[PDB]
């Protein structure tokens, strides 16, 4: 409907796949080459389904900060026959607050879904499902089961992936340029 939705749509149309694990279907952001991200609670194994294609996982790394605190981001390298458009130049370099974000989701359950979530707070620490988690972004939208892995964007930046909610707020894990060097 406006430039925020335009940037979000451009990311969804070229840089997302539907990932299926034993824990469900997730929006999965492709970042560059065969490298993608997914919430760590997706529990990626040796095999994953990508757009319903059986795919070998070549590497998977559950990220933690240098305090050895969960970040809730898993970086996956996929044995896929095609590269993603390189979007690393849209990743923030530092932890920040944002205005006017969109959360975008694409699954069997929620196709072509775009939510204007508004102002995004650098929340920091969250006890996420009982797990101490750092680098959390917070927005005041009542997100639901099925939106995990959803992409959080502003005009010109890909800032996070949706990892949870409390019924009134939603929470995303930061994406930082330094994760994908």
CSV table of N, CA and C in Angstrom, one decimal:
chain,number,residue,atom,x,y,z
A,1,UNK,N,0.8,-1.2,0.0
A,1,UNK,CA,0.0,0.0,0.0
A,1,UNK,C,0.9,1.3,0.0
A,2,UNK,N,2.1,1.2,0.4
A,2,UNK,CA,3.1,2.3,0.5
A,2,UNK,C,4.5,1.7,0.4
A,3,UNK,N,5.6,2.6,0.5
A,3,UNK,CA,7.0,2.2,0.3
A,3,UNK,C,7.5,1.1,1.3
A,4,UNK,N,7.0,1.1,2.5
A,4,UNK,CA,7.3,0.0,3.5
A,4,UNK,C,6.9,-1.3,2.9
A,5,UNK,N,5.6,-1.4,2.5
A,5,UNK,CA,5.1,-2.7,1.9
A,5,UNK,C,5.8,-3.0,0.6
A,6,UNK,N,6.2,-2.0,-0.1
A,6,UNK,CA,7.0,-2.2,-1.4
A,6,UNK,C,8.4,-2.9,-1.1
A,7,UNK,N,9.1,-2.4,-0.1
A,7,UNK,CA,10.4,-3.0,0.2
A,7,UNK,C,10.2,-4.4,0.7
A,8,UNK,N,9.2,-4.6,1.6
A,8,UNK,CA,8.9,-5.9,2.2
A,8,UNK,C,8.6,-6.9,1.1
A,9,UNK,N,7.7,-6.5,0.2
A,9,UNK,CA,7.3,-7.4,-0.9
A,9,UNK,C,8.5,-7.8,-1.8
A,10,UNK,N,9.4,-6.9,-2.0
A,10,UNK,CA,10.6,-7.2,-2.9
A,10,UNK,C,11.5,-8.2,-2.2
A,11,UNK,N,11.6,-8.1,-0.8
A,11,UNK,CA,12.3,-9.2,-0.1
A,11,UNK,C,11.6,-10.5,-0.1
A,12,UNK,N,10.3,-10.5,0.1
A,12,UNK,CA,9.5,-11.8,0.2
A,12,UNK,C,9.6,-12.5,-1.2
A,13,UNK,N,9.5,-11.7,-2.3
A,13,UNK,CA,9.3,-12.4,-3.6
A,13,UNK,C,10.6,-13.1,-4.1
A,14,UNK,N,11.8,-12.6,-3.6
A,14,UNK,CA,13.0,-13.2,-4.1
A,14,UNK,C,13.8,-13.9,-3.0
A,15,UNK,N,13.7,-13.5,-1.8
A,15,UNK,CA,14.6,-13.9,-0.7
A,15,UNK,C,13.9,-14.8,0.4
A,16,UNK,N,12.7,-15.4,0.1
A,16,UNK,CA,12.1,-16.3,1.1
A,16,UNK,C,11.8,-17.6,0.5
A,17,UNK,N,11.8,-18.7,1.3
A,17,UNK,CA,11.4,-20.0,1.0
A,17,UNK,C,10.5,-20.5,2.1
A,18,UNK,N,9.7,-21.5,1.9
A,18,UNK,CA,9.0,-22.2,3.0
A,18,UNK,C,9.8,-23.3,3.5
A,19,UNK,N,10.3,-23.3,4.8
A,19,UNK,CA,11.1,-24.3,5.4
A,19,UNK,C,10.1,-25.2,6.3
A,20,UNK,N,10.2,-26.5,6.1
A,20,UNK,CA,9.5,-27.4,7.0
A,20,UNK,C,10.5,-28.3,7.8
A,21,UNK,N,10.4,-28.3,9.1
A,21,UNK,CA,11.1,-29.2,10.0
A,21,UNK,C,10.1,-30.1,10.7
A,22,UNK,N,10.5,-31.0,11.6
A,22,UNK,CA,9.6,-31.8,12.5
A,22,UNK,C,8.8,-30.9,13.4
A,23,UNK,N,9.2,-29.6,13.6
A,23,UNK,CA,8.6,-28.7,14.5
A,23,UNK,C,7.6,-27.7,13.8
A,24,UNK,N,7.5,-27.8,12.5
A,24,UNK,CA,6.4,-27.1,11.7
A,24,UNK,C,7.0,-26.5,10.4
A,25,UNK,N,6.1,-25.6,9.8
A,25,UNK,CA,6.4,-24.8,8.6
A,25,UNK,C,6.8,-23.4,9.1
A,26,UNK,N,7.9,-22.9,8.5
A,26,UNK,CA,8.4,-21.5,8.9
A,26,UNK,C,8.7,-20.7,7.7
A,27,UNK,N,8.5,-19.4,7.7
A,27,UNK,CA,9.1,-18.4,6.8
A,27,UNK,C,10.6,-18.6,7.0
A,28,UNK,N,11.4,-18.6,5.9
A,28,UNK,CA,12.9,-18.7,6.0
A,28,UNK,C,13.5,-17.7,5.0
A,29,UNK,N,14.3,-16.8,5.6
A,29,UNK,CA,14.9,-15.7,4.8
A,29,UNK,C,16.3,-16.2,4.3
A,30,UNK,N,16.4,-16.2,2.9
A,30,UNK,CA,17.7,-16.4,2.2
A,30,UNK,C,18.5,-15.2,2.2
A,31,UNK,N,19.8,-15.2,2.6
A,31,UNK,CA,20.6,-14.0,2.7
A,31,UNK,C,21.6,-13.8,1.6
A,32,UNK,N,22.3,-14.9,1.2
A,32,UNK,CA,23.3,-14.9,0.1
A,32,UNK,C,23.6,-16.3,-0.2
A,33,UNK,N,24.1,-16.6,-1.4
A,33,UNK,CA,24.6,-17.9,-1.9
A,33,UNK,C,23.5,-18.9,-1.4
A,34,UNK,N,23.9,-20.0,-0.7
A,34,UNK,CA,22.9,-21.0,-0.2
A,34,UNK,C,22.6,-20.8,1.3
A,35,UNK,N,22.9,-19.6,1.8
A,35,UNK,CA,22.8,-19.4,3.3
A,35,UNK,C,21.5,-18.7,3.6
A,36,UNK,N,20.8,-19.3,4.6
A,36,UNK,CA,19.5,-18.7,5.1
A,36,UNK,C,19.4,-18.7,6.6
A,37,UNK,N,18.4,-18.1,7.1
A,37,UNK,CA,18.2,-18.1,8.6
A,37,UNK,C,16.8,-18.6,9.0
A,38,UNK,N,16.7,-19.1,10.2
A,38,UNK,CA,15.4,-19.6,10.7
A,38,UNK,C,15.5,-19.5,12.3
A,39,UNK,N,14.4,-19.4,13.0
A,39,UNK,CA,14.5,-19.4,14.5
A,39,UNK,C,15.1,-20.8,14.9
A,40,UNK,N,15.9,-20.7,16.0
A,40,UNK,CA,16.6,-21.9,16.5
A,40,UNK,C,15.6,-22.9,17.0
A,41,UNK,N,14.5,-22.5,17.5
A,41,UNK,CA,13.4,-23.4,18.0
A,41,UNK,C,12.8,-24.3,16.8
A,42,UNK,N,13.1,-24.0,15.6
A,42,UNK,CA,12.7,-24.8,14.4
A,42,UNK,C,13.4,-26.2,14.5
A,43,UNK,N,14.5,-26.3,15.2
A,43,UNK,CA,15.3,-27.5,15.5
A,43,UNK,C,15.7,-28.2,14.1
A,44,UNK,N,16.5,-27.4,13.4
A,44,UNK,CA,16.9,-27.9,12.0
A,44,UNK,C,17.8,-29.2,12.2
A,45,UNK,N,17.6,-30.2,11.4
A,45,UNK,CA,18.4,-31.4,11.4
A,45,UNK,C,19.3,-31.6,10.2
A,46,UNK,N,19.6,-32.8,9.8
A,46,UNK,CA,20.4,-33.1,8.7
A,46,UNK,C,19.7,-33.0,7.4
A,47,UNK,N,18.3,-33.1,7.4
A,47,UNK,CA,17.4,-32.9,6.2
A,47,UNK,C,16.3,-31.9,6.6
A,48,UNK,N,16.0,-31.1,5.7
A,48,UNK,CA,14.9,-30.1,5.8
A,48,UNK,C,14.1,-30.0,4.5
A,49,UNK,N,12.8,-29.7,4.5
A,49,UNK,CA,12.0,-29.5,3.3
A,49,UNK,C,12.0,-28.0,2.9
A,50,UNK,N,12.4,-27.7,1.7
A,50,UNK,CA,12.4,-26.3,1.2
A,50,UNK,C,11.5,-26.2,0.0
A,51,UNK,N,10.3,-25.5,0.2
A,51,UNK,CA,9.3,-25.4,-0.9
A,51,UNK,C,8.9,-26.9,-1.2
A,52,UNK,N,8.8,-27.8,-0.2
A,52,UNK,CA,8.4,-29.2,-0.3
A,52,UNK,C,9.4,-30.1,-1.1
A,53,UNK,N,10.6,-29.6,-1.3
A,53,UNK,CA,11.8,-30.4,-1.9
A,53,UNK,C,12.7,-30.9,-0.7
A,54,UNK,N,12.8,-32.2,-0.6
A,54,UNK,CA,13.8,-32.8,0.4
A,54,UNK,C,15.2,-32.2,0.1
A,55,UNK,N,15.8,-31.6,1.1
A,55,UNK,CA,17.1,-30.9,1.0
A,55,UNK,C,18.1,-31.2,2.1
A,56,UNK,N,19.3,-31.6,1.7
A,56,UNK,CA,20.4,-31.9,2.7
A,56,UNK,C,20.8,-30.5,3.3
A,57,UNK,N,21.0,-30.5,4.6
A,57,UNK,CA,21.6,-29.4,5.4
A,57,UNK,C,23.1,-29.6,5.4
A,58,UNK,N,23.9,-28.7,4.7
A,58,UNK,CA,25.3,-28.8,4.6
A,58,UNK,C,26.0,-28.3,5.9
A,59,UNK,N,25.4,-27.3,6.6
A,59,UNK,CA,25.9,-26.7,7.9
A,59,UNK,C,24.7,-26.0,8.6
A,60,UNK,N,24.7,-26.1,9.9
A,60,UNK,CA,23.7,-25.3,10.7
A,60,UNK,C,24.4,-24.8,12.0
A,61,UNK,N,24.2,-23.6,12.3
A,61,UNK,CA,24.9,-23.0,13.5
A,61,UNK,C,23.9,-22.1,14.3
A,62,UNK,N,23.5,-22.6,15.5
A,62,UNK,CA,22.7,-21.8,16.5
A,62,UNK,C,23.6,-20.7,17.1
A,63,UNK,N,23.3,-19.5,16.8
A,63,UNK,CA,24.2,-18.4,17.2
A,63,UNK,C,23.9,-18.1,18.7
A,64,UNK,N,25.0,-17.7,19.4
A,64,UNK,CA,25.0,-17.2,20.8
A,64,UNK,C,25.9,-16.0,20.8
A,65,UNK,N,25.7,-15.1,21.7
A,65,UNK,CA,26.6,-13.9,21.8
A,65,UNK,C,27.8,-14.3,22.7
A,66,UNK,N,28.7,-13.4,22.8
A,66,UNK,CA,30.0,-13.7,23.5
A,66,UNK,C,29.8,-13.7,25.0
A,67,UNK,N,28.6,-13.5,25.6
A,67,UNK,CA,28.3,-13.9,27.0
A,67,UNK,C,27.8,-15.4,27.0
A,68,UNK,N,27.7,-16.0,25.8
A,68,UNK,CA,27.2,-17.4,25.7
A,68,UNK,C,25.7,-17.4,26.0
A,69,UNK,N,25.0,-16.4,25.5
A,69,UNK,CA,23.5,-16.2,25.7
A,69,UNK,C,22.9,-16.5,24.3
A,70,UNK,N,21.8,-17.3,24.3
A,70,UNK,CA,21.0,-17.6,23.1
A,70,UNK,C,20.7,-16.3,22.3
A,71,UNK,N,20.9,-16.3,21.0
A,71,UNK,CA,20.3,-15.3,20.1
A,71,UNK,C,19.1,-15.7,19.3
A,72,UNK,N,18.7,-17.0,19.3
A,72,UNK,CA,17.5,-17.5,18.7
A,72,UNK,C,17.6,-17.5,17.2
A,73,UNK,N,18.8,-17.3,16.6
A,73,UNK,CA,19.0,-17.3,15.1
A,73,UNK,C,19.8,-18.6,14.8
A,74,UNK,N,19.3,-19.4,13.9
A,74,UNK,CA,20.2,-20.5,13.3
A,74,UNK,C,20.5,-20.1,11.9
A,75,UNK,N,21.8,-20.2,11.5
A,75,UNK,CA,22.3,-20.0,10.1
A,75,UNK,C,22.4,-21.3,9.5
A,76,UNK,N,21.7,-21.5,8.4
A,76,UNK,CA,21.7,-22.8,7.6
A,76,UNK,C,22.3,-22.6,6.3
A,77,UNK,N,23.2,-23.6,5.9
A,77,UNK,CA,23.6,-23.7,4.5
A,77,UNK,C,22.9,-24.9,3.9
A,78,UNK,N,22.2,-24.6,2.8
A,78,UNK,CA,21.3,-25.6,2.1
A,78,UNK,C,22.0,-26.2,0.9
A,79,UNK,N,21.9,-27.5,0.7
A,79,UNK,CA,22.4,-28.2,-0.6
A,79,UNK,C,21.3,-28.0,-1.7
A,80,UNK,N,21.2,-26.7,-2.1
A,80,UNK,CA,20.2,-26.2,-3.1
A,80,UNK,C,20.9,-25.9,-4.4
A,81,UNK,N,20.2,-26.1,-5.5
A,81,UNK,CA,20.9,-25.9,-6.8
A,81,UNK,C,20.8,-24.5,-7.3
A,82,UNK,N,20.5,-23.5,-6.4
A,82,UNK,CA,20.2,-22.1,-6.8
A,82,UNK,C,20.7,-21.2,-5.7
A,83,UNK,N,21.3,-20.1,-6.0
A,83,UNK,CA,21.7,-19.1,-5.0
A,83,UNK,C,20.6,-18.1,-4.7
A,84,UNK,N,20.6,-17.5,-3.6
A,84,UNK,CA,19.7,-16.3,-3.2
A,84,UNK,C,20.4,-15.1,-3.8
A,85,UNK,N,19.6,-14.1,-4.2
A,85,UNK,CA,20.0,-12.7,-4.3
A,85,UNK,C,20.7,-12.3,-3.1
A,86,UNK,N,21.9,-11.7,-3.2
A,86,UNK,CA,22.7,-11.2,-2.0
A,86,UNK,C,22.0,-10.0,-1.5
A,87,UNK,N,21.5,-10.1,-0.3
A,87,UNK,CA,20.8,-8.9,0.4
A,87,UNK,C,21.6,-8.5,1.6
A,88,UNK,N,22.9,-8.9,1.8
A,88,UNK,CA,23.6,-8.5,3.0
A,88,UNK,C,23.8,-7.0,3.1
A,89,UNK,N,23.8,-6.2,2.0
A,89,UNK,CA,23.9,-4.7,2.1
A,89,UNK,C,22.7,-4.1,2.7
A,90,UNK,N,21.6,-4.8,2.9
A,90,UNK,CA,20.3,-4.3,3.6
A,90,UNK,C,20.3,-4.6,5.1
A,91,UNK,N,21.4,-5.3,5.6
A,91,UNK,CA,21.5,-5.7,7.1
A,91,UNK,C,22.1,-4.5,7.9
A,92,UNK,N,21.5,-4.2,9.0
A,92,UNK,CA,22.1,-3.2,9.9
A,92,UNK,C,23.5,-3.6,10.5
A,93,UNK,N,24.3,-2.7,10.7
A,93,UNK,CA,25.7,-3.0,11.3
A,93,UNK,C,25.6,-3.1,12.9
A,94,UNK,N,24.6,-2.3,13.5
A,94,UNK,CA,24.6,-2.2,15.0
A,94,UNK,C,23.2,-2.4,15.5
A,95,UNK,N,23.0,-2.7,16.8
A,95,UNK,CA,21.8,-2.8,17.5
A,95,UNK,C,21.1,-1.4,17.5
A,96,UNK,N,19.8,-1.3,17.2
A,96,UNK,CA,19.1,0.0,17.0
A,96,UNK,C,17.6,-0.2,17.3
A,97,UNK,N,17.0,0.9,17.5
A,97,UNK,CA,15.5,1.1,17.4
A,97,UNK,C,15.1,1.6,16.0
A,98,UNK,N,13.8,1.3,15.7
A,98,UNK,CA,13.3,1.6,14.3
A,98,UNK,C,11.9,2.2,14.4
A,99,UNK,N,11.6,3.0,13.4
A,99,UNK,CA,10.1,3.4,13.2
A,99,UNK,C,9.5,2.6,12.0
A,100,UNK,N,8.3,2.3,12.0
A,100,UNK,CA,7.4,2.0,10.9
A,100,UNK,C,7.9,0.7,10.2
A,101,UNK,N,7.9,-0.4,11.0
A,101,UNK,CA,8.4,-1.7,10.4
A,101,UNK,C,7.2,-2.5,9.9
A,102,UNK,N,7.5,-3.4,9.0
A,102,UNK,CA,6.5,-4.4,8.5
A,102,UNK,C,7.1,-5.8,8.8
A,103,UNK,N,6.2,-6.7,9.3
A,103,UNK,CA,6.4,-8.1,9.5
A,103,UNK,C,5.8,-8.9,8.4
A,104,UNK,N,6.5,-9.6,7.5
A,104,UNK,CA,6.0,-10.3,6.4
A,104,UNK,C,6.2,-11.8,6.5
A,105,UNK,N,5.2,-12.6,6.2
A,105,UNK,CA,5.1,-14.1,6.4
A,105,UNK,C,4.6,-14.7,5.2
A,106,UNK,N,5.2,-15.9,4.8
A,106,UNK,CA,4.7,-16.7,3.7
A,106,UNK,C,4.8,-18.1,4.0
A,107,UNK,N,3.7,-18.7,4.4
A,107,UNK,CA,3.6,-20.2,4.6
A,107,UNK,C,2.3,-20.7,3.9
A,108,UNK,N,2.1,-22.1,3.9
A,108,UNK,CA,0.8,-22.7,3.5
A,108,UNK,C,-0.4,-22.1,4.3
A,109,UNK,N,-0.2,-21.9,5.6
A,109,UNK,CA,-1.3,-21.3,6.5
A,109,UNK,C,-1.5,-19.8,6.2
A,110,UNK,N,-0.4,-19.0,6.0
A,110,UNK,CA,-0.5,-17.6,5.9
A,110,UNK,C,0.3,-17.1,4.7
A,111,UNK,N,-0.2,-17.3,3.4
A,111,UNK,CA,0.4,-16.8,2.2
A,111,UNK,C,0.3,-15.3,2.0
A,112,UNK,N,1.4,-14.7,1.6
A,112,UNK,CA,1.4,-13.2,1.2
A,112,UNK,C,0.8,-12.4,2.3
A,113,UNK,N,1.2,-12.6,3.5
A,113,UNK,CA,0.8,-11.9,4.7
A,113,UNK,C,1.8,-10.7,5.0
A,114,UNK,N,1.3,-9.5,5.2
A,114,UNK,CA,2.1,-8.3,5.5
A,114,UNK,C,1.4,-7.6,6.7
A,115,UNK,N,2.1,-7.3,7.8
A,115,UNK,CA,1.6,-6.7,9.0
A,115,UNK,C,2.3,-5.4,9.3
A,116,UNK,N,1.7,-4.2,9.3
A,116,UNK,CA,2.4,-3.0,9.7
A,116,UNK,C,2.4,-3.0,11.3
A,117,UNK,N,3.6,-3.3,11.8
A,117,UNK,CA,3.7,-3.5,13.3
A,117,UNK,C,4.1,-2.2,14.0
A,118,UNK,N,4.5,-1.1,13.3
A,118,UNK,CA,4.8,0.2,13.8
A,118,UNK,C,6.2,0.3,14.4
A,119,UNK,N,6.3,1.0,15.5
A,119,UNK,CA,7.6,1.3,16.2
A,119,UNK,C,8.3,0.0,16.8
A,120,UNK,N,9.6,-0.1,16.6
A,120,UNK,CA,10.3,-1.3,17.0
A,120,UNK,C,11.4,-0.8,18.1
A,121,UNK,N,11.3,-1.4,19.3
A,121,UNK,CA,12.1,-1.1,20.5
A,121,UNK,C,13.3,-2.1,20.5
A,122,UNK,N,14.5,-1.6,20.7
A,122,UNK,CA,15.7,-2.4,21.1
A,122,UNK,C,15.4,-2.8,22.6
A,123,UNK,N,14.8,-4.0,22.7
A,123,UNK,CA,14.3,-4.5,24.0
A,123,UNK,C,15.4,-5.1,24.8
A,124,UNK,N,16.3,-5.8,24.1
A,124,UNK,CA,17.5,-6.5,24.7
A,124,UNK,C,17.2,-7.9,25.2
A,125,UNK,N,17.2,-8.0,26.6
A,125,UNK,CA,17.0,-9.3,27.2
A,125,UNK,C,15.5,-9.7,27.2
A,126,UNK,N,15.2,-10.9,26.9
A,126,UNK,CA,13.9,-11.6,27.0
A,126,UNK,C,14.1,-13.0,27.5
A,127,UNK,N,13.3,-13.4,28.4
A,127,UNK,CA,13.1,-14.8,28.8
A,127,UNK,C,12.1,-15.4,27.8
A,128,UNK,N,12.6,-16.0,26.7
A,128,UNK,CA,11.8,-16.5,25.6
A,128,UNK,C,11.5,-18.0,25.7
A,129,UNK,N,10.3,-18.4,26.1
A,129,UNK,CA,10.0,-19.8,26.3
A,129,UNK,C,10.9,-20.4,27.4
A,130,UNK,N,11.2,-19.6,28.4
A,130,UNK,CA,12.1,-20.1,29.5
A,130,UNK,C,13.6,-20.0,29.1
A,131,UNK,N,14.0,-19.6,27.9
A,131,UNK,CA,15.4,-19.5,27.5
A,131,UNK,C,15.9,-18.0,27.6
A,132,UNK,N,16.9,-17.6,28.4
A,132,UNK,CA,17.4,-16.2,28.4
A,132,UNK,C,17.9,-15.9,27.0
A,133,UNK,N,17.5,-14.9,26.4
A,133,UNK,CA,17.8,-14.5,25.0
A,133,UNK,C,18.2,-13.0,24.9
A,134,UNK,N,19.2,-12.7,24.1
A,134,UNK,CA,19.7,-11.3,23.9
A,134,UNK,C,19.3,-10.8,22.5
A,135,UNK,N,19.5,-9.5,22.3
A,135,UNK,CA,19.3,-8.8,21.0
A,135,UNK,C,17.9,-8.9,20.5
A,136,UNK,N,16.9,-8.8,21.4
A,136,UNK,CA,15.5,-8.9,21.0
A,136,UNK,C,14.9,-7.5,20.7
A,137,UNK,N,14.2,-7.5,19.6
A,137,UNK,CA,13.4,-6.3,19.1
A,137,UNK,C,12.0,-6.6,19.5
A,138,UNK,N,11.2,-5.5,19.9
A,138,UNK,CA,9.8,-5.7,20.4
A,138,UNK,C,8.9,-4.7,19.6
A,139,UNK,N,7.8,-5.2,19.2
A,139,UNK,CA,6.7,-4.4,18.5
A,139,UNK,C,5.4,-4.7,19.2
A,140,UNK,N,4.5,-3.7,19.1
A,140,UNK,CA,3.2,-3.8,19.8
A,140,UNK,C,2.1,-4.3,18.8
A,141,UNK,N,2.3,-5.6,18.4
A,141,UNK,CA,1.2,-6.3,17.6
A,141,UNK,C,1.0,-7.6,18.2
A,142,UNK,N,-0.2,-8.1,18.3
A,142,UNK,CA,-0.6,-9.4,18.8
A,142,UNK,C,-0.3,-10.6,17.8
A,143,UNK,N,1.0,-10.9,17.6
A,143,UNK,CA,1.4,-11.9,16.7
A,143,UNK,C,1.0,-13.3,17.2
A,144,UNK,N,0.9,-14.3,16.3
A,144,UNK,CA,0.3,-15.6,16.6
A,144,UNK,C,1.2,-16.7,16.1
A,145,UNK,N,1.0,-17.9,16.6
A,145,UNK,CA,1.5,-19.1,16.1
A,145,UNK,C,1.4,-19.1,14.5
A,146,UNK,N,2.5,-19.5,13.9
A,146,UNK,CA,2.5,-19.5,12.4
A,146,UNK,C,3.3,-18.3,11.8
A,147,UNK,N,3.7,-17.3,12.6
A,147,UNK,CA,4.4,-16.1,12.1
A,147,UNK,C,5.9,-16.2,12.4
A,148,UNK,N,6.4,-17.3,13.1
A,148,UNK,CA,7.8,-17.4,13.5
A,148,UNK,C,8.6,-17.6,12.2
A,149,UNK,N,9.7,-16.8,12.1
A,149,UNK,CA,10.6,-16.8,10.9
A,149,UNK,C,10.2,-15.6,10.0
A,150,UNK,N,9.1,-15.0,10.3
A,150,UNK,CA,8.6,-13.9,9.5
A,150,UNK,C,9.7,-12.8,9.5
A,151,UNK,N,9.8,-12.1,8.4
A,151,UNK,CA,10.8,-11.1,8.2
A,151,UNK,C,10.4,-9.7,8.6
A,152,UNK,N,11.2,-9.0,9.4
A,152,UNK,CA,10.9,-7.6,9.9
A,152,UNK,C,11.8,-6.7,9.1
A,153,UNK,N,11.2,-5.7,8.4
A,153,UNK,CA,11.9,-4.8,7.5
A,153,UNK,C,11.4,-3.4,7.8
A,154,UNK,N,12.3,-2.4,7.6
A,154,UNK,CA,11.9,-1.0,7.3
A,154,UNK,C,12.2,-0.7,5.9
A,155,UNK,N,11.8,0.5,5.4
A,155,UNK,CA,12.3,0.9,4.1
A,155,UNK,C,13.8,0.8,4.1
A,156,UNK,N,14.4,0.0,3.3
A,156,UNK,CA,15.8,-0.1,2.9
A,156,UNK,C,16.5,-1.0,3.9
A,157,UNK,N,15.9,-1.6,5.0
A,157,UNK,CA,16.6,-2.5,5.9
A,157,UNK,C,15.9,-3.7,6.3
A,158,UNK,N,16.6,-4.8,6.3
A,158,UNK,CA,16.1,-6.1,6.9
A,158,UNK,C,16.6,-6.3,8.3
A,159,UNK,N,15.8,-6.1,9.3
A,159,UNK,CA,16.3,-5.9,10.7
A,159,UNK,C,16.2,-7.1,11.6
A,160,UNK,N,15.4,-8.1,11.3
A,160,UNK,CA,15.1,-9.2,12.2
A,160,UNK,C,14.2,-10.3,11.7
A,161,UNK,N,14.1,-11.3,12.4
A,161,UNK,CA,13.2,-12.5,12.1
A,161,UNK,C,12.3,-12.7,13.4
A,162,UNK,N,11.0,-12.8,13.2
A,162,UNK,CA,10.0,-13.0,14.3
A,162,UNK,C,10.3,-14.3,15.0
A,163,UNK,N,10.4,-14.3,16.4
A,163,UNK,CA,10.7,-15.5,17.2
A,163,UNK,C,9.7,-15.8,18.3
A,164,UNK,N,8.8,-14.9,18.6
A,164,UNK,CA,7.8,-15.2,19.7
A,164,UNK,C,6.9,-14.0,20.0
A,165,UNK,N,6.0,-14.2,21.0
A,165,UNK,CA,5.0,-13.2,21.4
A,165,UNK,C,4.4,-13.5,22.7
A,166,UNK,N,3.8,-12.5,23.3
A,166,UNK,CA,3.1,-12.8,24.7
A,166,UNK,C,1.6,-12.5,24.5
A,167,UNK,N,1.0,-12.5,23.3
A,167,UNK,CA,-0.4,-12.3,23.1
A,167,UNK,C,-0.7,-10.8,22.8
A,168,UNK,N,0.1,-9.8,23.2
A,168,UNK,CA,-0.1,-8.4,23.0
A,168,UNK,C,1.1,-7.8,22.2
A,169,UNK,N,2.3,-8.2,22.6
A,169,UNK,CA,3.6,-7.9,21.9
A,169,UNK,C,4.1,-9.0,21.1
A,170,UNK,N,4.9,-8.7,20.1
A,170,UNK,CA,5.8,-9.6,19.3
A,170,UNK,C,7.2,-9.3,19.4
A,171,UNK,N,8.1,-10.3,19.2
A,171,UNK,CA,9.5,-10.2,19.5
A,171,UNK,C,10.3,-10.8,18.3
A,172,UNK,N,11.3,-10.1,17.9
A,172,UNK,CA,12.2,-10.6,16.8
A,172,UNK,C,13.6,-10.7,17.3
A,173,UNK,N,14.4,-11.6,16.7
A,173,UNK,CA,15.8,-11.6,16.9
A,173,UNK,C,16.5,-10.7,15.9
A,174,UNK,N,17.4,-9.9,16.3
A,174,UNK,CA,18.1,-9.0,15.4
A,174,UNK,C,18.9,-9.7,14.3
A,175,UNK,N,18.9,-9.2,13.1
A,175,UNK,CA,19.9,-9.6,12.1
A,175,UNK,C,21.0,-8.5,12.0
A,176,UNK,N,22.2,-8.9,12.0
A,176,UNK,CA,23.4,-8.0,12.0
A,176,UNK,C,24.2,-8.4,10.8
A,177,UNK,N,24.8,-7.4,10.1
A,177,UNK,CA,25.7,-7.7,8.9
A,177,UNK,C,26.9,-8.6,9.4
A,178,UNK,N,27.4,-8.5,10.6
A,178,UNK,CA,28.5,-9.3,11.1
A,178,UNK,C,28.2,-10.8,11.2
A,179,UNK,N,26.9,-11.2,11.2
A,179,UNK,CA,26.6,-12.6,11.2
A,179,UNK,C,27.0,-13.3,9.9
A,180,UNK,N,27.1,-12.6,8.8
A,180,UNK,CA,27.1,-13.2,7.4
A,180,UNK,C,28.3,-12.8,6.6
A,181,UNK,N,29.4,-12.4,7.3
A,181,UNK,CA,30.7,-12.2,6.7
A,181,UNK,C,31.3,-13.6,6.3
